[PDB]
Amino acid sequence: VEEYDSLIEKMSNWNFPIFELVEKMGEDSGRILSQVMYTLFQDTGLLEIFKIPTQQFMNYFRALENGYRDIPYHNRIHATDVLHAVWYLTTRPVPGLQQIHIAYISSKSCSNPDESYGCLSSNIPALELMALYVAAAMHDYDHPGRTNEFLVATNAPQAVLYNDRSVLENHHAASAWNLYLSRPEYNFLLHLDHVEFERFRFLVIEAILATDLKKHFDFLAEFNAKANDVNSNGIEWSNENDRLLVCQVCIKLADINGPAKVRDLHLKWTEGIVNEFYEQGDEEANLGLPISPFMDRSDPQLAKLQESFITHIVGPLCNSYDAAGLLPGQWLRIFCQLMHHLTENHKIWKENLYF
Amino acid sequence: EYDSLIEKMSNWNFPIFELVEKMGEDSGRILSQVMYTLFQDTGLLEIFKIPTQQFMNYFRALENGYRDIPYHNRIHATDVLHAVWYLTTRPVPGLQQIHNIAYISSKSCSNPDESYGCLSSNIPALELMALYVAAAMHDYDHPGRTNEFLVATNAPQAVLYNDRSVLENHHAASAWNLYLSRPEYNFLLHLDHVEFERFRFLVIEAILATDLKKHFDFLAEFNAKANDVNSNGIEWSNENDRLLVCQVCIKLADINGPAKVRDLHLKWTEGIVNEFYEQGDEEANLGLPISPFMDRSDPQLAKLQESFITHIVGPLCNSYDAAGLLPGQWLRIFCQLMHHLTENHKIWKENLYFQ
Ligand SMILES: [C]OC1=[C]C2=C([C]=[C]1)C(O[C])=[C]C(C(=O)[N]C1=[C]C(C(=O)N([C])[C]C3=[C][C]=[C][C]=[C]3)=[C]C([B]([O])=O)=[C]1)=N2
Ligand SMILES: [C]OC1=[C]C2=C([C]=[C]1)C(O[C])=[C]C(C(=O)[N]C1=[C]C(C(=O)N([C])[C]C3=[C][C]=[C][C]=[C]3)=[C]C([B]([O])=O)=[C]1)=N2
Ligand SMILES: [Mg+2]
Ligand SMILES: [Mg+2]
Ligand SMILES: [Mg+2]
Ligand SMILES: [Mg+2]
């Protein structure tokens, strides 16, 4: 209860210094995702709204956590960071977004300054935002630190099992749900009815499956058509598919936040993913496979990787989200914190490349 | 045996149940024998230098993976394989030829003249083999339940595949898993990494197209390309246009019954309802709502047949026929299975309206 208010205050910062929390937990850093999950459901009130008994909640997420491996990047910490991002993006105030309001959540840890500000929490039903948060928690569960391309190339059992389509992302969702159903001391959704649960599950899976970057430009196209058509009105908040698509793009952005954060955090995350890349290159080399781009430890091209990734993947996504007026910011023109971070970071790396 | 069979199968209404009966004790080998026969007829054995031993090893395994169930069995698999072969080889009125990169011709007929074309002339041999192999696999290890049943009951397969195309993913996944499960099966040993990778892709795409939840999606996409009056139809040079044609081809092959002689249509109908009723029997036992048309003690057999021919089969055949891809002959044009389809559609409309 003392600890609760300490943490919720730290996480109200977009640049939540998570690695300090991992260090502060030291010995019990393995429980980071379960503690943050609890904290955020309390903050959003999702516990009271769906009458979630704490024992099972904690049972499940404690299991989920342990399903994340001890690997540089695709671990409990990443899962937690992404969960934070989606929560922040869906709760915090957005300039010029209409409010509207089947239950809906509010973050106890802030009210919309005025009526010129809206929250996604006001426009997306609580059931749907819970899916997104739970999806964030699961989205990389039991990730083996290899890419889809690697698994397909090597005809890995998983790759065969899923016919080479969204191999990891299907496995994340499948083994996560398999866990949830694997014992009754996990069924924290016991107070949702058949239809609510069916739907919840659907929404979670769609959210997880959207994190595959092979589908990146497809998702991005579909979103600009709906949201960023100049002759259309953007997002019909009343429409089921328009709401899902918003959440899909939200988690997509949450999953790759680093370049839109302070350098300190961006670089820590970078360190993690390349270390995971190099382990894969090490294995590729051993099996006599062509070493994937930017995975040859004896040739980083770290500037080229960062710039390419910001330019081709992160940049266009954030601009679509920003153009659609869905990014939390404040009035002056509008100041969008992570668009500043993204631009500052994009410039630093353009610089290291050119010179 | 060879010349006997190939002559019988040159009939669109190939009387398969006679062949199953004629094979009697060796009726379990029907799919492997027909597979062999048709690759010989098309010359696919010589073109990809396929060693018979492994070919037969694999397909004999594949056969055994088909269960002893009313409808989704080796016989259905064989029927569908026949349909795709017939549709892709036989002469099509008014279709341009192009190449008759390897292409096949059926030893068991030449285009009567230059006013006739074959699909075999317009789709590469690699791609048509995928289709045929896909037909063979397309229902492998089918448990005689619907996707909706497996999803409803949170069956392990349904969880494994996150409720998307559950059976169709399993058909392709466990089929390929078998092919790779021992080297005495590798009949494609003379394709290079790229050719094989691609072949596999094409096979899976073909199998996954047989999910009827994607029916209206596939149907839309096809009429857009093929039957647009302001577009120039099918670019036979284009990879995606050719795949889509094969997808629609197998789609149509999987549900051919209504476009066959009433004798055959009704035999197939008998099979599927017997499979339906076994599922209803189980639904009843688990205290689940019995799915439409699955309560043996209440067939509504006319309503099922009429609905299915009108809403699923009818529109598909008309799209294929409008796009001028159906084998037929000049007079106007007589399309045999359009006649069958219409006569059958009328007989069922009649049993409904009147009885
Ligand atoms: C959150 O903070 C950051 C996250 C960063 C990052 C920097 C900060 C970064 O700097 C260059 C790179 C990545 C990155 O590559 N993540 C990632 C990649 C793939 C993958 O699919 N790869 C490498 C093939 C691919 C690349 C481009 C397009 C398609 C495929 C799968 C997963 B995952 O979590 O499952 C995650 N993430
Ligand atoms: C080859 O010749 C014939 C084939 C016939 C047929 C008559 C002749 C027939 O008469 C009623 C019905 C069927 C049929 O239903 N096949 C089938 C259906 C579904 C399915 O998805 N069902 C039942 C829900 C559904 C029904 C209609 C529309 C959408 C969904 C899954 C699979 B399978 O193999 O997995 C196979 N096939
Ligand atoms: Mg991932
Ligand atoms: Mg991730
Ligand atoms: Mg099927
Ligand atoms: Mg079938």
Structure report:
In chain A, strand 3 and strand 4 form a beta hairpin. Chain A is globular. The first copy, chain A, has one domain: 3'5'-cyclic nucleotide phosphodiesterase, catalytic domain (Catalytic domain of cyclic nucleotide phosphodiesterase 4b2b). Chain A has 355 residues and is an all-alpha fold. The first copy, chain A, is 59% helix and 2% strand. At the A-B interface, helix 10 and helix 11 of A face helix 9, helix 10 and helix 11 of B. Bound molecules: the ligand [C]OC1=[C]C2=C([C]=[C]1)C(O[C])=[C]C(C(=O)[N]C1=[C]C(C(=O)N([C])[C]C3=[C][C]=[C][C]=[C]3)=[C]C([B]([O])=O)=[C]1)=N2 (2 copies) and magnesium ion (4 copies). One magnesium ion (MG) binds next to loops of chain A. Chain B: This is cGMP-inhibited 3',5'-cyclic phosphodiesterase 3B. Chain B: It comes from Homo sapiens (Human). Chain B: Belongs to the cyclic nucleotide phosphodiesterase family. PDE3 subfamily.
What key attributes describe this structure?
homodimer, 355 residues, mainly alpha, Catalytic domain of cyclic nucleotide phosphodiesterase 4b2b, two-stranded antiparallel ribbon, two-stranded antiparallel sheet, 59% helix, globular, binds the ligand [C]OC1=[C]C2=C([C]=[C]1)C(O[C])=[C]C(C(=O)[N]C1=[C]C(C(=O)N([C])[C]C3=[C][C]=[C][C]=[C]3)=[C]C([B]([O])=O)=[C]1)=N2, binds magnesium ion, cGMP-inhibited 3',5'-cyclic phosphodiesterase 3B (chain A)
Q: What is the CATH architecture term of chain A? A: Orthogonal Bundle
Termini of chain A, distance in Å?
A: 52 Å
* CATH homologous superfamily label of chain A: 3'5'-cyclic nucleotide phosphodiesterase, catalytic domain
Largest interface: A-B, 17 and 18 residues
Helix content of chain A: 55-70%
User: What's the number of helices of chain A?
Assistant: 16
